[PDB]
């Protein structure tokens, strides 16, 4: 009815899985495109999934020929197959938004036309040290070396501190299209989850995030020690970046806070984002519930995106050992107020996002205290 439609999700990792939990609560059929038995398929026992990859032309097209709206839980999808099937199903958010967004360098130039403040950069026309060395004397060291495509979870980033790191950097991001970014000296990082609807623009509070080795680690929601003046500029900034893109759906906005208190965009995501996991226990409508509603033109009471109590989300990243992530979840079993989410991801690879723990509390202070020991254990591994 309002829930008879089928939703095609390109990608079926943890994100796709949180989306399915939300789908399941409303009895909306979610057909997933990804490997068999992926995280999302694991909790949706029916026959509509499609086996194959989201960057796969014919797999992308089959999914679409069987669903009323096709969405994505990842950006590195075949937007060409999507333009091809644009006539057979609705796509939200838009294939052009995804195509743009999926190339970081391209995303950025798209936004610069829009006024968006963002770190200086230089594309790398070949992958020579000569080239890099050059760009180095153009924007200084260190600098962030980055792959234009396929990057997520710090996977296409490489900090270059000196000209002596050059070969390692290049090796590291071997055979990928690159660009370098002038350093961003942030006093903190922020993120706003924006929701684009048929007739409205909604958003959650600004949160403070902490990244290490280029990967998100913690999220404090709402953001600590930030004036309502900053929260605000942050929010405007985020809505602006989003308005630059076509589509209904949840959008993730990453910004850096300058020592000067001014704001910079770090990157924009045309999907459900790690920065918003706290919404599950943190608000009445999680980002995941929100996103389905948006792409299905279902209501979204704004009150439901307000934060119920303070919270902190800690990621459970693969460590040196492959058992290691379990030890963290295990410790979480004893943190008061800690909600544990394991991704059913398989082999835990170092740096691999394997699950998250979200801790709430009537006050940050107290949420901070409940979680310390778990960060402590997490830290020593």
Ligand X SMILES: Nc1cncn1[C@@H]1O[C@H](COP(=O)(O)O)[C@@H](O)[C@H]1O
Ligand Y SMILES: Nc1ncnc2c1ncn2[C@@H]1O[C@H](COP(=O)(O)OP(=O)(O)O)[C@@H](O)[C@H]1O
Count of positions on this chain that bind ligand X (CB under 6 A): 13
DSSP string covering 319-344, please? -SSSSHHHHHHHHHTTSTTEEEEE--
CB 357 within 8 A of CB 338: yes
**How far is residue 138's CA from residue 234's CA, in Å, rounded to a whole number?**
29
Structure tokens at 70: 């096709």
Query: Where along the sequence are the contacts to Na ion (CB under 5 A)?
Result: 211
Selected binder of ligand Y within 78, 131, 165, 181 (CB under 6 A)? 181
Q: Which stretch binds its own copies (CB under 8 A): 170-178, 203-211, 241-249, 328-336?
A: 328-336
Q: Using CB under 6 A as the criterion, what x/- string covers residues 219-258 for binding ligand Y?
A: -----------------------------------x----
Task: Identify residues 335-354 at the interface with its own copies (CB under 8 A).
Answer: 335-344
- Using the minimum distance from each CB to its own copies, give the nearer residue, 13 or 156: 13
- Using the minimum distance from each CB to ligand X, give the nearer residue, 74 or 124: 74
- Using the minimum distance from each CB to its own copies, give the nearer residue, 99 or 293: 293
**How far is residue 7's CA from residue 23's CA, in Å, rounded to a whole number?**
9
Decide which of Na ion, its own copies, Mg ion, none touches 211; Cβ closer than 5 to 8 Å per partner kind: Na ion
* HEC profile of 168-227: HHHHHCCCCCEEEEECCCEEEEEEEEEEECCCCEEECCCEEEEEECCEEEEEEECCCCCC
Selected binder of ligand Y within 116, 139, 150, 184 (CB under 6 A)? 184
Q: Closest distance between ligand X and the C-beta of residue 353, in Å?
A: 5
Selected binder of ligand X within 64, 69, 70, 73 (CB under 6 A)? 73
Crossing angle of helices 324-332 and 364-379, rounded to 10°: 150
Strand ranges inside the chain, DSSP E: 6-10, 29-34, 50-51, 69-72, 90-91, 121-124, 143-147, 157-160, 178-182, 186-196, 201-203, 207-212, 215-221, 249-258, 263-269, 311-317, 338-342, 353-360
Q: Does residue number 152 form part of the binding site for ligand Y (CB under 6 A)?
A: yes
Selected binder of ligand Y within 119, 244, 258, 340 (CB under 6 A)? 119
Q: Does residue number 149 form part of the binding site for ligand X (CB under 6 A)?
A: no
Q: Does residue number 153 form part of the binding site for ligand X (CB under 6 A)?
A: yes
Selected binder of ligand X within 14, 22, 71, 275 (CB under 6 A)? 14
**How far is residue 268's CA from residue 143's CA, in Å, rounded to a whole number?**
20
Q: Does residue number 131 form part of the binding site for ligand X (CB under 6 A)?
A: no
Q: Which stretch binds ligand X (CB under 6 A): 11-19, 113-121, 207-215, 306-314?
A: 11-19
Tell me which DSSP letter residue 137 carries.
H
- Using the minimum distance from each CB to ligand X, give the nearer residue, 150 or 258: 150
Is the four-CA dihedral 281, 287, 292, 293 of positive or negative sign?
A: positive
Is the four-CA dihedral 199, 201, 204, 205 of positive or negative sign?
A: negative
Q: Which residue ranges make up the annotated binding site? A: 75, 104, 146, 153-154, 157, 181-182, 184, 189, 211, 254, 266-267
- Using the minimum distance from each CB to Na ion, give the nearer residue, 106 or 211: 211
Q: Does residue number 319 form part of the binding site for ligand X (CB under 6 A)?
A: no
- Using the minimum distance from each CB to Na ion, give the nearer residue, 66 or 211: 211
């Amino acid at each position: 009815m309002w829930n008879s439609r089928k939703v095609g999700v390109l990608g079926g990792g943890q994100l796709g899985r949180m989306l399915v939990e939300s789908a399941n609560r409303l009895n909306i059929q979610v057909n997933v495109l990804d490997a068999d038995n992926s995280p999302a398929k694991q909790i949706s026992a029916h026959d509509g999934h499609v086996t194959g990859s989201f960057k796969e032309r014919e797999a992308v097209r089959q999914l679409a020929k069987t669903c009323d709206v096709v969405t994505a839980e990842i950006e590195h999808v075949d937007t060409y197959a999507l333009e091809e099937v644009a006539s057979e199903v609705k796509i939200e958010p838009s294939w052009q938004a995804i195509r743009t967004i999926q190339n970081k360098f391209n995303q950025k130039e798209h936004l610069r036309k829009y006024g968006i403040p963002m770190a200086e950069h230089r594309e790398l026309v070949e992958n020579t040290p000569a080239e890099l060395a050059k760009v180095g004397e153009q924007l200084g060291y260190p600098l962030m070396l980055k792959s234009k495509t396929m990057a997520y979870d710090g996977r296409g980033n490489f900090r270059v501190n000196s000209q002596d790191d050059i070969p390692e950097a290049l090796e590291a991001l071997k055979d990928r299209p690159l660009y370098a970014e002038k350093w961003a000296y942030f006093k903190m990082e922020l993120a706003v989850i924006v929701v684009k609807t048929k007739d409205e623009v909604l958003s959650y509070p600004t949160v403070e995030t902490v990244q290490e080795d280029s990967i998100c680690k913690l999220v404090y929601a709402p953001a600590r020690n930030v004036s309502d003046a900053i929260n605000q500029k942050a929010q405007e900034l985020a809505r602006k970046a989003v308005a630059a893109f076509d589509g209904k759906g949840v959008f993730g906005v990453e910004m850096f806070l300058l020592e000067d208190d001014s704001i910079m965009l770090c990157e924009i995501a045309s999907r459900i984002h790690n920065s918003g996991h706290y919404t599950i226990e943190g608000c009445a409508l999680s980002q995941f519930d929100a996103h389905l509603r948006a792409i299905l033109d279902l209501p979204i009471p704004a009150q439901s995106l307000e934060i119920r109590q303070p919270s902190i989300m800690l990621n459970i990243i693969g460590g040196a050992a492959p058992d290691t992530h379990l030890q963290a979840a295990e410790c979480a079993l004893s943190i008061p107020n800690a909600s544990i989410h394991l991704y059913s991801k398989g082999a835990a690879k170092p740096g691999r996002k394997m699950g998250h723990i979200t801790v709430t509390a009537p006050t940050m202070h107290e949420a901070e205290t409940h979680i310390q020991p778990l960060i402590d254990v997490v830290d020593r591994i």
